[PDB]
Amino acid sequence: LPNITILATGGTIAGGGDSATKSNYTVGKVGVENLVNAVPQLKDIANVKGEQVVNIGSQDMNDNVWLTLAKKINTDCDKTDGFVITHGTDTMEETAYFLDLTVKCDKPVVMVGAMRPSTSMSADGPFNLYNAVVTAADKASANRGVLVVMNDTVLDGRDVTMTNTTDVATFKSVNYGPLGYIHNGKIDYQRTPARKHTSDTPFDVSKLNELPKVGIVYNYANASDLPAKALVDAGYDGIVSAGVGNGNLYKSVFDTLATAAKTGTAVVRSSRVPTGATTQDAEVDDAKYGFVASGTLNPQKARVLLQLALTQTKDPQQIQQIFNQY
Amino acid sequence: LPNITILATGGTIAGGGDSATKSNYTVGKVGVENLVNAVPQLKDIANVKGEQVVNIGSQDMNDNVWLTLAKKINTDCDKTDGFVITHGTDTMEETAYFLDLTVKCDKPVVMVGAMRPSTSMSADGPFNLYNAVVTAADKASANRGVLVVMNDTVLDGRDVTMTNTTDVATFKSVNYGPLGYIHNGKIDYQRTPARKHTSDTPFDVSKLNELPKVGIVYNYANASDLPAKALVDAGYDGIVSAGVGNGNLYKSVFDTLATAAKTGTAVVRSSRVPTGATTQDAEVDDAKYGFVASGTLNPQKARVLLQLALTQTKDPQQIQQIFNQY
Amino acid sequence: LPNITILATGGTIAVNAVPQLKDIANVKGEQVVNIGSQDMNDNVWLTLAKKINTDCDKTDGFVITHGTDTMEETAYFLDLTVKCDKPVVMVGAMRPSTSMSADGPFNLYNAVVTAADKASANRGVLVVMNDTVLDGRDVTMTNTTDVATFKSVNYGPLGYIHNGKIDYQRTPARKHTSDTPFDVSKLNELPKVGIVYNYANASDLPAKALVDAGYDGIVSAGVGNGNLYKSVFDTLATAAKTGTAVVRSSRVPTGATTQDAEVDDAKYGFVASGTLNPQKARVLLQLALTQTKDPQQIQQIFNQY
Amino acid sequence: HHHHHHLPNITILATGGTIAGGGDSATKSNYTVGKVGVENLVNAVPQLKDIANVKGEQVVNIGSQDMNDNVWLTLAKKINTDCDKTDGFVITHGTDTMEETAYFLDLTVKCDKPVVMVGAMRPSTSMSADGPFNLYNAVVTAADKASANRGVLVVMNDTVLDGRDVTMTNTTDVATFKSVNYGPLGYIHNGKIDYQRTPARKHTSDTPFDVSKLNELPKVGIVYNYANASDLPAKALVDAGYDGIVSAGVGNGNLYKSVFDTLATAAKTGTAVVRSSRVPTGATTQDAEVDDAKYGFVASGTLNPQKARVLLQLALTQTKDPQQIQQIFNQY
Ligand SMILES: N[C@@H](CC(=O)O)C(=O)O
Ligand SMILES: N[C@@H](CC(=O)O)C(=O)O
C-alpha cells in the first residue's frame, strides 16, 4: 500500500449544516483526522496521513496559502508516494493551476472537494476522497501534472473549471476533456496535458513570500473604466481582462488598459465566455498595445500564469511566449 | 407576407476582413441596406424595411443605444408585424434581456448576429439573418418575449448566453434550453419562458434618458477590493458580484459590498460559473447583509435586471421579489 | 402534508433509508414488480398505467422507483397513457444503495419533494434525478455511469431543486396524460415494434426477421438525420408498402430526424420521429398502432405527442 | 541565401457525402448526394492554392449512409500504397458514418503522414454552406507537420478530433462532431492549430491489423436493446453465421433477458459478442452487472456500438478468443 499524504485546507468537504435536507452550511467544521476516519475504506488502498494546513472556505483562498502548499509539497515530496489536497470547490480550479506550475514533485498531486457538505443526504465528499486517494496511489498518475478528481473523473489542473453552481458533476475540462475515468478503483488514462507543468516550468516559489499583484476586471455593456484605473493607480503588476466574446474590451476599458500596457502594467486579454481561446489576430492588435492573449486560460487561470510570469519577466513578448507554453 | 422591420446596430454580421481566409476583421462598417440586399431570399418570406440605429461593435454597446432601441421598437410596434435586430455577438445576450424587459409590443422581436465576418469562407451571417426573419414572421413567435436566433435555434432572451469565444454554435440557453429548432423555414416550438417578459413587466423606459449605474466586480483567489471601492466612490446605484461557486465573495470584496449595502447601494450576488442559480440558503445570509441573490441570471444579465429594478425601488426586499419574477 | 404513494419496480435504487421523508409527505409503498429495468417490458407498463389511473383518487401524488437503464422509456409510456393529472415522478439511482456516496437516498427525497409540489401537477410524467426535474418525453441518459446522466437533451429541464423547493421555468408543449387518446385501460398486450440499427455495411437480416415475424412496426436507428443503409432502406420500403408502420429515428443522441432532407417520406410511406430517439419512438409507435395503421395519421401523431 | 516557403502536396480522396451534395434551393433543406465531382469541390475553394498543392482523386461518390467494407478496404490500401507520393491526405466523406470510416482508417493506415477526414452538415447549395471552410481547415490540418503521429483525424467546425473518440452529437448541427469522452486534440484559428492532446490508444503503424491482402472483413452486426426487445435481430445474425455481434446495451451495456440468452448461446458456438451501450458517452465497463468472463463476452469500453463493430471486425482477422479480443479492446 502506498503512503499518501492528505493536506487539508478546509472547504465544503470539511463543512457542515444543522440538517441533512436543508442547503445551509459553513466550511471548516470537520478536521482532517475525522475526514479520513469517516472513510475507513481508505485503509484498503493506502497508508494515509493527514495534515491540516489551513481551514478556510476556498472563496477566501489567497497567495499565502498557495505559497505554503507549493513549499510543503516540494519539501515533503521525498517523504511520501503521493499527495491529496482537500479544498473548497469555489477556487479549486485556481489552486490546481498554481500548483500545476509550481510543484516540482512529479509524484501524483490530486486535489479534491465536495459540492455537498459532509452532513447532507448523499454527500459526495466520501466517495470523492476515496477516488482522489485511488488516483494519487496509481503509478500511472505521475508525470501528468497536478490533478483534480471529482465525480469519478481525473481532470488536469490547467483545463479543469466549474460548469455549474451546485451540480456534483460541475468540474469539467471544458476545452480539451478529462484525462481518465475511474471505475471500480481503476483508471483508464487516455490523455495527458501537452502544456508544460511541474518540474518543466521555470517558476520556483521556494524563497518567495509574496506574489506579483494581478487583478481581474469584467467587461459588459456600458462598463466603467474605474476598476481598471484603480488597479493601475495602486501600482498592480498586471491586469487580466474578462473580455466579451473573443477577449474584447469595452471602449473605455480598452483606452485605460492600452495606456497601462504602454506604461509598463502587464495586460492579459481573457474572456468571460466559459470555453474557447482568447485568440491573437482578431479585432485587437495585441503587438501594437503590448497586450497578451490568454488562449484557453479563463480570467482566473490567466491571473495565475500572469502572476508567475511576472516573477520571471515584465516583457510583453516574453509573457506571450509563457502563455503559449504553460 | 408579413411586414418585417430590421433595426441594425452593427456587429460582425455587418463587418469585414481584407481576406475570406484570415481571421482579422473590423465591425459595424456595412449599412443595413447593403446587408439586406446581400440576402435577396428575405423577399420570399417577408416585406423587409431596414433602419440604421447605430453601427458599432457590440463590445461598445451602452445604455444610450439600449434606450434608443427600446423607445423605437415601442413607438413603431403598431406599424410593423415584427422586428429583427442585427447586432454584435459579444453583448447580444445583454441587449436581448434588456429588450425582453422593456419592449411593451407582444409582436416578435428577434436578435441576430454572426460569429464569422461577412467576407469569410462559410460566413454564417446570411443564413442566420434568413432564419431570424423566418422566426420574426412566424405567428407562433409572438408572446414568447425577445428572442435570439442563431445556428438554426430559437433562444429566449433571458437564458441565452455565449458558451464559446468563436464557435458559430456558441449561443445556448444553458439552464433551460432552447424554445424551438428551425428546419426548412419552419419552427417546432416546444417551450416558452415562464419568467414574465415584455408587456407583463412593470419596466417602462419611454421617458428615461439614463439608467441607474450598475457595475460588475469579479471574484477570484486573493481578489482586490479596489474595483468594488471604485464603483462605490463613483456613487454607483448597484453592484453585481460575479461570485465564485454559488455566488460567494472573496473576504475583501464581501467587506466592501457589505459596507456599500449599509449605505443603500443595491448588491446582487451572481456567479462567474456559467450555469446554475446563485441561490439563497447556502453560505451567505442575504437578509443579514441586504443582498439579493441573482438566481440563474449571470453577472451581465443580473446587471440588466438590477438597473431596471432600481427604476422602480431601492429596497433590497423588493429587488429580491423582482429577481424572483423576471 | 400530502399523501404520496411509492410504486416500486426494482432497479439499483433498491423508505427507512430516508426517514426525512416524513417531514414532507405521508408516504406509503406498494411493490408492483421487482426487476432490473434492462428487463422492463410491455406487461409492466400496462400494470403501472392501469394502477396509476385506478388509484389516482386514493392519493395526492405518485413516485415510481425504477431501474435507470430504461427509465426514459417507461416515463414516456406513462407520459402518454396516465390520465391522473396529479404529480407522477419516476426516480432511480446510478450507484448501489450500499456504495459510498450512494445517490438513491437524496434522489428519493427530491422525487417526493417534486411529487408533493402543487406546481408539478399538469406537467406530464416527470423524472427527477440529480436535483433536476425532467419531462418524460425529452429525458434520456447521456452517460453510462455518471450520477448526472439524465438530461432533457433537446429542450432542457423544467426546473431545478434547491433546499427542497423548485423554480419551474418550463413545461412541455407536446400533448400528454389526459390530452392524448391513448387508453390502455382494457389492453393486455401492445402492438409489436422492434428497433433496427444502421451503420456501415448494415445487415438487412434484423429488419427481415421483424418483417417475417409480422411485427406491426419497425423503428430505424438511422445514421445522421435518420438515414438508412441501402439493404435496410429496401427491406423497410418493401415492408412499408405491405402494411408495416416504419419510423425513421436516429442513433445520434440529440436533434430531430426531419422530413425534407434526403428521404422522401411521403413517397415511401415512412414517418419521421422528430426529436424522439429510437426507444422513445418505439413507445409512441406502439401506442399510435392502437389507434391507426395509416402512415399519414401516424406522422400526425408524431407531430402532436 | 534566404529560405523559400514551399507548400506541401495534399491528396484529396473524395468518397461523396453532403459536402458534394446539392438541392433545388439555398433556403430549402432537401438535397441528394453523389452530384458533385472532386474537380468541382477543389474549383469551389480556390484558397486551397494558398496553403497546399492539391490533387483530387474520386474513389467513390456515395452518401455515407451506404458506406461499406469494400470502400474501407479501397481507402486503406490506397493510402498505404500512395503514402510516398504525397505529403498528406484529406478524405471528403459523408457525415453519417464518418466516425466509423475514421476509426477503421485509424487502425489500418500504416502511412504516418497526416490523414484528415472532412464533411459538411449543409449541402454545397445551402446558404452559409459549411463545406468550403471545413475543406480549407482539413487541408490546413493535413499540411501541419504537428498533425503527424496523432492517428487519423476528423476536422469539422474549426476543431481537430481523433478518429477513435470522434462521434456525431446532433442530427443537423454544423457543430455535431465532438470527441465526447476525451475531448478534441486542437482548435484551428487563422489557419493555425494549438494541439494540446494526442490519443494514448495505439493506432496506425502501432497496430497489428493489416488489410493489404484482404478483400472482405469478418461479418459483424449490431443489435439494439430497449424494453420488451425482440431476440429476432440477434437470432438472425447467429443463423447467418456472423463472426461477431455488437450489442447496443441499455445503461452500462446491459441486455434485455431474451437478447442475453441468445448472445450467451452465440458466444458458446463461436460468435464473438461485444457489449457496447446505446448511451452516447461513457464506458461499457467490466465488473458491473454482466460477468463477461463467465459468458465469454467482451466489454467495449468507451467505443460506441458502430465503433466497437470496427475493432471487433479487425480483432476477428487475428483471433476468435474472447480473452484476446478483450485485450484488443483495452489497447486500441
Ligand atoms: N466584436 C464583434 C463580434 C461579432 O459580432 O462576431 C461584436 O460583438 O460586434
Ligand atoms: N440495471 C439497473 C441499473 C441501475 O438502476 O443503476 C436497472 O436499470 O435496473
Side-chain angles (χ1 to χ4, degrees):
Chain A
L1 299 184
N3 287 0
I4 301 301
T5 298
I6 304 178
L7 300 177
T9 70
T12 304
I13 197 165
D18 283 341
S19 175
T21 42
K22 298 180 60 55
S23 47
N24 313 70
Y25 70 89
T26 311
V27 291
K29 297 204 191 198
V30 179
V32 71
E33 255 232 279
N34 270 24
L35 248 200
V36 167
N37 284 338
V39 187
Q41 304 86 347
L42 292 180
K43 304 264 231 330
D44 296 340
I45 54 172
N47 304 316
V48 175
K49 273 165 199 114
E51 307 174 52
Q52 195 82 36
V53 174
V54 290
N55 187 40
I56 57 177
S58 87
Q59 59 268 53
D60 294 331
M61 187 52 56
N62 58 76
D63 289 1
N64 293 319
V65 177
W66 287 350
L67 292 166
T68 295
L69 284 170
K71 285 175 194 172
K72 173 135 200 86
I73 291 163
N74 289 336
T75 291
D76 286 0
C77 187
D78 71 343
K79 303 191 181 66
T80 189
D81 298 329
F83 289 94
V84 165
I85 311 178
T86 59
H87 192 290
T89 50
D90 299 356
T91 61
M92 186 153 51
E93 77 198 72
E94 305 172 45
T95 304
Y97 185 50
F98 181 83
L99 296 174
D100 196 33
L101 297 170
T102 62
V103 158
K104 301 308 167 178
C105 193
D106 277 312
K107 312 188 184 181
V109 177
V110 175
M111 303 196 68
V112 69
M115 292 299 289
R116 301 175 175 155
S118 61
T119 41
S120 61
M121 304 188 41
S122 293
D124 60 320
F127 194 51
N128 279 346
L129 181 52
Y130 181 83
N131 278 336
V133 172
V134 160
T135 304
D138 183 353
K139 296 146 18 76
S141 303
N143 301 119
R144 297 191 190 264
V146 169
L147 309 170
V148 170
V149 170
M150 297 288 279
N151 195 44
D152 306 356
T153 314
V154 182
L155 307 147
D156 76 271
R158 184 184 200 282
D159 206 38
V160 62
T161 190
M162 295 190 73
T163 56
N164 187 268
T165 56
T166 62
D167 188 341
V168 294
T170 186
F171 286 91
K172 296 300 204 292
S173 277
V174 299
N175 294 296
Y176 296 98
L179 308 187
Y181 290 98
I182 308 175
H183 189 252
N184 193 35
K186 288 164 304 187
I187 309 165
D188 188 37
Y189 277 124
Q190 292 201 33
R191 289 298 199 278
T192 198
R195 287 294 179 112
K196 295 187 175 100
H197 46 75
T198 49
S199 61
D200 293 326
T201 87
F203 304 121
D204 172 354
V205 295
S206 64
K207 302 189 177 179
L208 258 25
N209 290 311
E210 62 224 68
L211 265 13
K213 284 180 226 295
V214 173
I216 302 177
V217 295
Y218 211 73
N219 291 259
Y220 55 98
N222 212 119
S224 179
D225 59 11
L226 292 176
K229 243 123 134 178
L231 295 169
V232 178
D233 291 351
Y236 263 54
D237 304 295
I239 305 174
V240 173
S241 169
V244 291
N246 181 8
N248 291 313
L249 309 172
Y250 184 68
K251 61 170 180 246
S252 65
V253 179
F254 199 127
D255 294 333
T256 295
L257 289 178
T259 307
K262 191 173 212 284
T263 47
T265 311
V267 176
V268 169
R269 300 199 301 104
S270 183
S271 176
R272 75 186 188 172
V273 176
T275 80
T278 293
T279 73
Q280 301 179 246
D281 321 312
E283 292 175 58
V284 177
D285 189 352
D286 297 301
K288 176 174 158 96
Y289 300 105
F291 296 158
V292 173
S294 76
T296 66
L297 293 182
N298 78 25
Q300 56 273 16
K301 297 269 196 187
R303 168 169 179 278
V304 175
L305 182 55
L306 184 55
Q307 281 187 293
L308 286 167
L310 290 163
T311 68
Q312 298 274 308
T313 180
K314 295 155 32 57
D315 176 65
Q317 299 169 102
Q318 291 183 139
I319 300 173
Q320 183 63 82
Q321 186 53 28
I322 287 166
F323 271 75
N324 297 337
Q325 289 192 179
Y326 312 99
Chain B
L1 303 179
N3 286 335
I4 303 295
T5 298
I6 298 169
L7 299 182
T9 68
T12 299
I13 190 166
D18 328 67
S19 166
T21 258
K22 321 214 84 134
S23 55
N24 305 72
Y25 70 95
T26 56
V27 286
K29 277 223 268 162
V30 155
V32 66
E33 190 157 43
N34 290 171
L35 207 60
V36 162
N37 289 334
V39 192
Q41 293 107 330
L42 293 184
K43 291 195 118 119
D44 311 344
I45 46 172
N47 299 307
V48 166
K49 162 172 95 142
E51 296 181 77
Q52 199 82 44
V53 178
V54 290
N55 215 163
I56 64 171
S58 75
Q59 59 266 44
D60 290 333
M61 183 58 54
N62 55 70
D63 296 350
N64 298 137
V65 172
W66 281 7
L67 288 163
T68 305
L69 276 168
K71 284 174 186 178
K72 183 160 185 63
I73 289 166
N74 290 325
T75 292
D76 296 357
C77 161
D78 207 337
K79 26 147 137 36
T80 190
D81 298 321
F83 298 87
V84 173
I85 312 145
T86 64
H87 197 282
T89 54
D90 302 347
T91 63
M92 181 158 58
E93 76 195 70
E94 295 179 44
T95 308
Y97 189 44
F98 180 85
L99 297 174
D100 197 30
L101 296 171
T102 63
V103 161
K104 321 310 287 181
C105 214
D106 287 321
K107 296 189 194 184
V109 180
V110 175
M111 294 193 83
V112 63
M115 292 299 285
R116 296 171 177 156
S118 67
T119 47
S120 60
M121 299 181 263
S122 293
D124 51 322
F127 193 57
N128 279 349
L129 184 53
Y130 189 82
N131 272 341
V133 173
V134 165
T135 301
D138 186 350
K139 65 191 200 164
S141 288
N143 295 115
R144 298 197 189 254
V146 172
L147 305 176
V148 168
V149 168
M150 288 294 277
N151 197 43
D152 298 7
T153 312
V154 186
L155 306 154
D156 75 97
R158 183 182 201 280
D159 206 34
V160 68
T161 190
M162 292 193 74
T163 53
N164 187 267
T165 51
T166 60
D167 186 339
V168 294
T170 191
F171 289 89
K172 303 283 206 299
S173 285
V174 295
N175 295 292
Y176 294 103
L179 308 186
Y181 294 91
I182 312 162
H183 185 260
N184 201 23
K186 301 200 245 49
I187 311 175
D188 182 40
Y189 277 111
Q190 290 197 33
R191 295 294 198 267
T192 203
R195 291 278 174 132
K196 296 194 192 85
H197 54 68
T198 56
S199 62
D200 287 335
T201 85
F203 304 118
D204 188 316
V205 299
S206 53
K207 307 308 184 181
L208 253 24
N209 290 305
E210 65 177 63
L211 267 351
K213 294 206 238 323
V214 172
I216 307 181
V217 300
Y218 208 73
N219 293 261
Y220 51 96
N222 217 104
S224 179
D225 65 11
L226 297 170
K229 285 161 131 78
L231 297 175
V232 170
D233 284 352
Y236 264 58
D237 298 290
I239 308 173
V240 174
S241 171
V244 293
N246 186 359
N248 287 319
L249 296 103
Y250 181 74
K251 64 166 130 73
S252 296
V253 185
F254 203 146
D255 287 341
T256 291
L257 297 187
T259 280
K262 291 164 176 347
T263 65
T265 305
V267 173
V268 164
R269 297 202 297 104
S270 183
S271 176
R272 74 190 187 178
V273 177
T275 77
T278 296
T279 72
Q280 291 182 245
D281 314 325
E283 287 178 76
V284 179
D285 185 348
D286 288 307
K288 180 144 61 135
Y289 293 106
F291 297 163
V292 174
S294 68
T296 67
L297 297 170
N298 73 28
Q300 57 270 17
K301 292 285 186 172
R303 161 169 186 275
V304 173
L305 185 56
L306 182 58
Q307 284 185 304
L308 289 167
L310 282 166
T311 69
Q312 290 278 304
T313 180
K314 300 178 192 315
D315 185 347
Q317 293 180 345
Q318 288 177 317
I319 303 178
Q320 179 71 71
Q321 297 149 10
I322 285 163
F323 267 80
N324 295 343
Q325 291 175 41
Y326 311 99
Chain C
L1 293 191
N3 297 319
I4 298 303
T5 297
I6 300 174
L7 299 180
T9 72
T12 308
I13 187 149
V15 172
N16 300 355
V18 194
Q20 301 93 325
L21 290 178
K22 318 152 175 105
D23 312 335
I24 57 172
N26 293 306
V27 171
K28 179 184 73 51
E30 300 187 55
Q31 210 67 32
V32 177
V33 304
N34 184 191
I35 59 176
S37 69
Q38 60 273 39
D39 292 328
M40 182 56 54
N41 60 68
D42 294 351
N43 297 135
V44 185
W45 294 355
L46 286 169
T47 301
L48 283 175
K50 284 168 188 176
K51 174 136 181 100
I52 296 162
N53 289 343
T54 298
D55 292 354
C56 184
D57 280 325
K58 292 190 184 66
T59 198
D60 294 322
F62 295 88
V63 168
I64 310 147
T65 54
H66 185 288
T68 51
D69 296 356
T70 64
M71 179 153 59
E72 67 199 76
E73 296 179 45
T74 306
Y76 190 40
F77 173 88
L78 294 180
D79 199 27
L80 298 167
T81 61
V82 338
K83 307 294 183 199
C84 181
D85 265 307
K86 300 181 192 182
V88 175
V89 180
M90 303 202 61
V91 61
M94 296 291 291
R95 304 184 168 151
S97 64
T98 54
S99 60
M100 290 179 267
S101 295
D103 48 329
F106 193 44
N107 284 342
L108 185 51
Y109 186 78
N110 277 341
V112 174
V113 167
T114 301
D117 184 353
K118 279 159 211 210
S120 308
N122 297 278
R123 288 181 202 267
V125 168
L126 305 171
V127 167
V128 171
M129 292 291 284
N130 193 47
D131 308 357
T132 310
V133 185
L134 303 152
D135 77 271
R137 180 181 209 278
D138 199 40
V139 73
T140 183
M141 309 185 61
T142 57
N143 185 265
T144 54
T145 59
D146 191 337
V147 295
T149 187
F150 288 95
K151 292 289 201 305
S152 294
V153 294
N154 296 291
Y155 291 105
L158 303 189
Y160 295 94
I161 309 180
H162 190 261
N163 201 24
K165 286 147 150 26
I166 307 166
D167 177 31
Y168 280 120
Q169 294 203 29
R170 295 289 203 275
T171 197
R174 285 276 173 129
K175 287 174 165 142
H176 54 70
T177 57
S178 54
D179 296 310
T180 83
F182 309 124
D183 180 355
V184 301
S185 54
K186 300 147 137 64
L187 278 33
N188 288 307
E189 60 171 61
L190 261 1
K192 298 209 303 292
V193 177
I195 297 172
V196 303
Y197 207 75
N198 291 262
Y199 56 91
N201 216 117
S203 178
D204 62 7
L205 296 171
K208 285 178 154 156
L210 296 181
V211 170
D212 287 345
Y215 265 47
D216 295 297
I218 305 179
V219 178
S220 165
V223 299
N225 189 353
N227 292 315
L228 306 110
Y229 186 73
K230 46 188 196 164
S231 284
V232 177
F233 195 138
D234 292 338
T235 297
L236 302 182
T238 298
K241 274 172 181 80
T242 59
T244 303
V246 172
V247 175
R248 297 203 293 118
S249 186
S250 176
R251 69 196 191 171
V252 175
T254 79
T257 296
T258 72
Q259 292 185 67
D260 288 309
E262 295 171 72
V263 175
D264 182 348
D265 289 303
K267 183 157 102 81
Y268 290 102
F270 292 160
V271 165
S273 73
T275 60
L276 294 176
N277 73 30
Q279 62 261 21
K280 300 268 188 182
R282 171 168 176 285
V283 170
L284 183 58
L285 186 55
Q286 291 185 287
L287 285 171
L289 284 167
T290 71
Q291 309 280 314
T292 185
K293 325 214 332 189
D294 177 32
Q296 291 167 59
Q297 296 169 172
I298 297 177
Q299 181 64 74
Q300 283 178 289
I301 287 178
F302 270 77
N303 295 349
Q304 280 179 299
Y305 307 100
Chain D
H1 279 269
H2 298 282
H3 283 310
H4 307 268
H5 186 58
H6 308 273
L7 295 176
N9 297 282
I10 299 295
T11 300
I12 298 170
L13 297 182
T15 71
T18 304
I19 192 160
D24 252 0
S25 172
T27 56
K28 300 196 274 232
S29 51
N30 302 75
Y31 69 86
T32 307
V33 301
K35 333 219 312 195
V36 184
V38 65
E39 174 180 16
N40 298 123
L41 276 180
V42 177
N43 285 344
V45 186
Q47 301 91 348
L48 300 186
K49 302 180 223 299
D50 296 338
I51 54 174
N53 296 309
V54 163
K55 290 210 151 113
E57 294 186 51
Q58 199 75 44
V59 177
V60 291
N61 210 348
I62 61 175
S64 77
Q65 66 261 53
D66 290 333
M67 187 54 54
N68 67 59
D69 292 352
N70 294 144
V71 174
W72 288 352
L73 291 167
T74 297
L75 285 168
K77 291 168 188 181
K78 180 144 189 75
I79 292 158
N80 288 332
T81 298
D82 291 357
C83 183
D84 64 330
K85 305 202 181 78
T86 188
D87 299 315
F89 290 90
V90 171
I91 304 164
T92 65
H93 196 283
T95 57
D96 290 3
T97 63
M98 189 150 50
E99 72 194 76
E100 307 177 38
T101 313
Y103 185 47
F104 178 83
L105 293 177
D106 199 25
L107 294 168
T108 59
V109 163
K110 304 309 178 181
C111 180
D112 262 313
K113 310 183 185 180
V115 179
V116 181
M117 308 199 68
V118 68
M121 288 300 286
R122 301 179 173 150
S124 69
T125 55
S126 49
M127 196 180 302
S128 286
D130 55 328
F133 195 44
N134 280 343
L135 181 60
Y136 185 90
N137 276 342
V139 165
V140 169
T141 305
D144 185 353
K145 306 168 273 105
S147 301
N149 297 102
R150 288 184 200 271
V152 170
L153 312 171
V154 168
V155 171
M156 296 289 284
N157 196 47
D158 305 359
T159 310
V160 183
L161 307 146
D162 80 273
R164 182 180 205 274
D165 201 43
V166 67
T167 188
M168 294 187 72
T169 64
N170 185 273
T171 56
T172 57
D173 189 338
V174 292
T176 186
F177 284 93
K178 299 292 204 296
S179 286
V180 298
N181 293 303
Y182 292 100
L185 305 191
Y187 294 94
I188 311 172
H189 188 257
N190 191 32
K192 287 169 318 195
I193 308 177
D194 186 29
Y195 283 114
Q196 297 201 27
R197 295 299 201 275
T198 196
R201 286 292 179 112
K202 286 170 136 85
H203 50 71
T204 59
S205 62
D206 288 341
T207 84
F209 307 117
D210 171 2
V211 302
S212 63
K213 301 197 178 99
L214 267 57
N215 304 305
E216 60 179 69
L217 253 13
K219 295 218 290 283
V220 173
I222 307 178
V223 301
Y224 208 78
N225 290 268
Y226 54 97
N228 215 99
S230 182
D231 56 13
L232 292 165
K235 289 176 155 167
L237 299 176
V238 165
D239 283 350
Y242 264 53
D243 300 296
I245 300 171
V246 174
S247 168
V250 299
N252 190 356
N254 290 316
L255 307 165
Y256 182 71
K257 47 215 242 264
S258 65
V259 176
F260 200 138
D261 287 341
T262 298
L263 294 183
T265 296
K268 272 184 175 75
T269 65
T271 303
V273 185
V274 173
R275 292 203 302 114
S276 181
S277 177
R278 67 186 191 178
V279 184
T281 80
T284 300
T285 72
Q286 298 187 65
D287 309 321
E289 291 172 63
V290 177
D291 190 332
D292 291 301
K294 165 171 178 176
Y295 294 109
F297 290 160
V298 171
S300 70
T302 65
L303 299 173
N304 75 36
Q306 55 270 17
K307 299 278 194 174
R309 169 170 174 278
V310 167
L311 189 54
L312 180 55
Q313 282 181 303
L314 288 168
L316 285 163
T317 65
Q318 307 295 285
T319 179
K320 282 91 85 66
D321 180 66
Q323 283 134 92
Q324 289 186 301
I325 299 169
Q326 183 71 74
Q327 293 187 116
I328 283 164
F329 276 72
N330 292 343
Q331 294 175 316
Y332 304 98

